């Protein structure tokens, strides 16, 4: 029932493999749909004047033993991103950050979801009730670990990590 989406990942100029993700559309349908549509790029051009699509965007902030963060396809540095909806409200906090390899929304406070997201690499319970958890990695866990190793304490990647393709 739940959509399954993927990112193909390159680290530097080198294809790393694919992260395959389940989105919890059954419990978090608005948040899952935004992410699904940003993987396919099916909504076309956005309000920022760029494609509403993760393809070509990077994991711009990577912290080892914490998480990997991406989805800023408008500014590429954490200051941008946009939802298919034009920010949206925190849908619910049904799921918690109780495991690595969960997908959750980055934000800039309450009810500011756009396109940025993270994949956890540890439990992040201090984020419960503040970031909407909306899926998990099904396959490609080792790719997430390879991305994570490219992180830094200041979050700056030591090698670029690109979503070279995305979709269903």
């Amino acid at each position: 029932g739940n959509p399954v989406v993927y990112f193909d990942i390159s680290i530097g100029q080198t294809p790393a493999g694919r992260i395959t993700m389940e989105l919890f559309a059954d419990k978090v349908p608005i948040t899952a749909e935004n992410f699904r549509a940003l993987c396919t790029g099916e909504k076309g051009m956005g309000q920022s004047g760029k494609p509403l699509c993760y393809t070509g965007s990077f994991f711009h902030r990577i912290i080892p033993q914490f998480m990997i963060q991406g989805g800023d396809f408008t500014r590429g540095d954490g200051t941008g991103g946009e939802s298919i909806y034009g920010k949206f409200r925190d849908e619910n906090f049904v799921y918690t950050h109780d495991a690595p390899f969960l997908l959750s929304m980055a934000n800039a406070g309450p009810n500011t979801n756009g396109s940025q997201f993270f994949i956890t690499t540890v439990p992040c319970p201090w984020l419960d009730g503040k970031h909407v958890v909306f899926g998990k990695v099904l396959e490609g866990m080792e790719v997430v670990k390879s991305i994570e190793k490219c992180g830094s304490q200041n979050g700056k990647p030591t090698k670029s990590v690109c979503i070279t393709a995305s979709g269903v």
Binding site: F66, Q69, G78, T79, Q116, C124, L127
Partner: peptide, 11 residues
């Protein structure tokens, strides 16, 4: 600290 924000990364 360990947050996941979009614009002003905090401690």
């Amino acid at each position: 600290x360990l947050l996941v924000t979009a614009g002003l990364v905090l401690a």
